[model samples]
Target chain A: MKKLLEELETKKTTIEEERNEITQRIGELKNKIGDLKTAIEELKKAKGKCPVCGRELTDEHREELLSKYHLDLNNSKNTLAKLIDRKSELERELRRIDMEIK
Target chain B: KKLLEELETKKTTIEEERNEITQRIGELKNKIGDLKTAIEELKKAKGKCPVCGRELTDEHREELLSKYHLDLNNSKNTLAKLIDRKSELERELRRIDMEIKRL
Candidate 1:
């Protein structure tokens, strides 16, 4: 029983390490999303005029371009959400290991 | 040769799409210009000065403002600045589109 408990503690430590790595990656991706939004806002400003003809942009067209940008940004946001959820699952596994050791 | 021909056709398609986008940009810009012009007309106070009750011609009022109204100068200046910024973005975008085709 003592040997089994020692082995369980080792597994729990490894799982915790993996969860920490995943959480760090989640932080990096969140920063990346912030930068992407800044670049996208600048691009939307570009949508407001024609370089060649010197015309102003319309609200309807701006909405269309903005919606497309939002969709692409949402894809990245969803990927980050999935990584965080996976990290949570690993945390749950760590809890189970603790219960077993106890 | 067939692969090369297909690539050229696809390239043409991209060029066409770019042209269409450019036209849309033009239409939007013209509409914005019209809006600014309307604002300018309103600033003329619909044919008279509220201060002295002196009747003002559009051209004369514009000249006086061009001559004296330094504060409202920001309105025309703002439109010019926005227009300049919008143009720069379009230029960058067009350049990028060309690069995409080159690839």
Candidate 2:
């Protein structure tokens, strides 16, 4: 009984530790997502725009914008998706531990 | 007057965009600081189970070590990508500033 309960305690602690780390990471990732969303919005607005004259951008400017901001936007979005998946896994682990004790 | 109006509008729009970028960068930095603090607190608070208030068993210790090592790796990867994106925005903002000067 002592060892069984100890095992439970150990499992619970692992879950708790994972929870804390995941929670903080989720917070950070959410903020980054917000930042990324805003950046992508800005990028969409600025796409094909002349920074100086408010005219259509030159092909060079357009391509560079597409290459840089578009690529970063896609990567940020993809990473955000992966982070959320990791968060879901941690959350599920916590729930499982809670259920086991209950 | 028409050309002046157009130029003024363009300048105002660009300036607003520039300001928005600056604002978000500031917010991201603040968030980064908060994340650092929280992570430090989590690390400091280690060594015992919160639910049972017991010392970690050997298995738990080893498990946590490996698990958190993996977490650290993921965190580093995410943070690097975020920092890189932030720098990209900063560079673009600088370029826009130069263009504004040219105008």
Candidate 3:
């Protein structure tokens, strides 16, 4: 019973570590998503001029940035989904461990 | 007197047509103004719904602004056409006026 208690504590700590890491990652991903949205908006508004630079934006340059924004946005979104799933599993595992201790 | 009356009738017809064109031009001008204001407000709102005070997704905000710009462009085009028509009627009225005056 003592060894089982120790093992449970070790498992809980590992889970907690992952939980914090995932939580921080989730925050970063959300911030990235917000930034990407802003970038996309600015690019769309840019006629022949860039909103950020206040200079001319060639069609080629503007198209490139738009493509990059979409790509990065897609990456951030998928990564966020996986992180959320991981965080949820960790919470469930933590709950189970707490019940076991109880 | 008969020739004068004929010119008077023609001038009146041209003036009435111009009046119709003037009203249409004014309507499209106001519509374009409203559209421009809406686009600016949407940009200023920055993903917030001005009407409901709810948060809007970036995509939705972008869509709303795009629609507004399209409406503005269409209104401007309509206003241009109306102005052209008004000018034609105005010229017609001027010609009739000179004819009536001479008679």
Candidate 4:
């Protein structure tokens, strides 16, 4: 009975650990998502037109476009990192749980 | 009984979350509309350059601002599309979360 009870506690602890890790990873993803959104808004304000030739142009728009693309590229990089991190985390967690069960 | 009550509460929260997502989607669509209008306005705007006395297209105008205008606009549009997709994914996530909560 004592061994079974101990095993149950370990199982619960493993689950709790996993839940916390997921929650933290989710939060980090959300923050990057927020940053992407904000950069987009800032890019929008870059509206401009050429005052010289009656041709509409905005350097802000161009710069923002380039800047945002680079920003998103970085975000994609981070996403890859997060995916690997999460996968490893899950793998570690699963192995630990399996050992406990054994 | 307590677990059942908790489930009911979760259901209510999920419903509210869905409604909020719907509202966000509407707003995002409107924002897209604004961008479309901006692009149109840029397209329609044309006048002869005072110095060159030549009719300038939006492309020519962009050239005046910077040589990099055309490519930038294309890139910007791509980013906008991605941003829109991100918003959509967000709504999907919320819906999925709600579904999970119900389960």
| Per-model fnat list | 0.00, 0.00, 0.00, 0.19
In order, what lDDT does every prediction score?
Answer: 0.60, 0.56, 0.77, 0.57
List each model's interface RMSD.
Answer: 15.8, 20.9, 10.8, 10.9
Using TM-score as the yardstick, the better of models 1 and 2 is: 1
Off by over 4 Å in 4: A1-15, A27-31, A34-46, A49-65, A83-85, B1-32, B35-103
lDDT by residue for model 1 (B1-103), tens = 6655666666566556656655655665665554444334335344753212246567765655453334345545655665566566566656656655665
State which docking tier applies to candidate 3. incorrect
For this target, which candidate reaches the highest DockQ against the unseen true structure? Answer: 4
Q: Write the per-residue lDDT of candidate 2 for residues B1-103, one digit (tens) a residue.
A: 6655665666566567656656665665654554343333224224642212235455554555455456556655666665666566566656656665566
What's model 1's interface RMSD, roughly to a tenth of an angstrom?
Answer: 15.8
Q: TM-score for each prediction?
A: 0.39, 0.36, 0.51, 0.30
Instruction: Find the 10 residues in a row with the least total lDDT in model 1 chain B.
Output: B44-53
Clashing residue pairs found in predicted model 3: none
Kindly give the stretch of ten consecutive residues in candidate 2 chain B with the minimal lDDT sum.
B44-53
Which of the two candidates, 1 or 3, achieves a greater DockQ against the reference? 3
Which scores higher on lDDT, 2 or 4?
4
Best by TM-score: 3
lDDT of 4 by residue, A32-89 (tens): 6654554444344444643234334467544745475557758766785776587677
Candidate 4, residues B10-63, lDDT tens digits: the string is: 656656765665666566565555444344334433664322224766666565
